[PDB]
Design an enzyme around this catalytic site. Sequence first.
Site: not given
Ligand SMILES: COc1ccc(Cn2nnc(-c3cccc(C(=O)NCc4ccc(C(=O)O)cc4)c3)n2)cc1
Ligand SMILES: [Ca+2]
Ligand SMILES: [Zn+2]
Ligand SMILES: [Zn+2]
Length: 167
Positions: A84, A91, A95, A119-120, A123, A129, A137
């Site tokens: 998260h 502050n 983070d 993704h984080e 945020h 989201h 996201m």
């Molecule tokens: C909380 O963390 C979260 C992270 C992601 C999401 C939503 N979400 N899941 N997948 C994708 C999401 C969106 C767009 C593309 C891709 C994906 O897989 N691309 C291929 C890829 C991945 C990593 C690497 C590398 O390591 O270099 C290279 C290529 C995934 N978005 C939700 C939560």
């Molecule tokens: Ca901070």
């Molecule tokens: Zn925390």
């Molecule tokens: Zn999130």
Amino acid sequence: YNVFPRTLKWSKMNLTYRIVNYTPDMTHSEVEKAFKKAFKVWSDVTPLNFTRLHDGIADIMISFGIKEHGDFYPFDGPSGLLAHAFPPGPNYGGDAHFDDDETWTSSSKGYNLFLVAAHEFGHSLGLDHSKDPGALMFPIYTYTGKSHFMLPDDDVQGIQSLYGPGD
Ligand SMILES: COc1ccc(Cn2nnc(-c3cccc(C(=O)NCc4ccc(C(=O)O)cc4)c3)n2)cc1
Ligand SMILES: [Ca+2]
Ligand SMILES: [Zn+2]
Ligand SMILES: [Zn+2]
Ligand SMILES: [Ca+2]
Ligand SMILES: [Ca+2]
């Protein structure tokens, strides 16, 4: 006089981050590279720049922890909450905390740290989201398997609504 800003965004384009501790699952280098790549996702489409610090207080303080780890957002063991992060601000703002009960990788096994970090940091930069299942996201981790990462248009639109394009 001054009034509080209306939008949760960074009012400066040059931001800092710091890795406060590290996961057992990956080397320091692998963790450092994952976070650098994650930040590049956002700097590629905005005027934002990112610098890593080795000490002090960075805008974006990054750590690994489990269960209760010093805030109101405790973790929950493998899967579920992977991480998260706090909206932009002073502050705690910005983070990012990662659940060290996850198996972190730089592959399709376990959870890809670059992907979760990307993704984080969304945020951390002001994005909530998406309701689009294909967006970065979207709440739920859904690895596509595709060879190279490309930031979906929904997330580009979202981040540029706060900061505009890089140029
Ligand atoms: C909380 O963390 C979260 C992270 C992601 C999401 C939503 N979400 N899941 N997948 C994708 C999401 C969106 C767009 C593309 C891709 C994906 O897989 N691309 C291929 C890829 C991945 C990593 C690497 C590398 O390591 O270099 C290279 C290529 C995934 N978005 C939700 C939560
Ligand atoms: Ca901070
Ligand atoms: Zn925390
Ligand atoms: Zn999130
Ligand atoms: Ca978890
Ligand atoms: Ca672990």
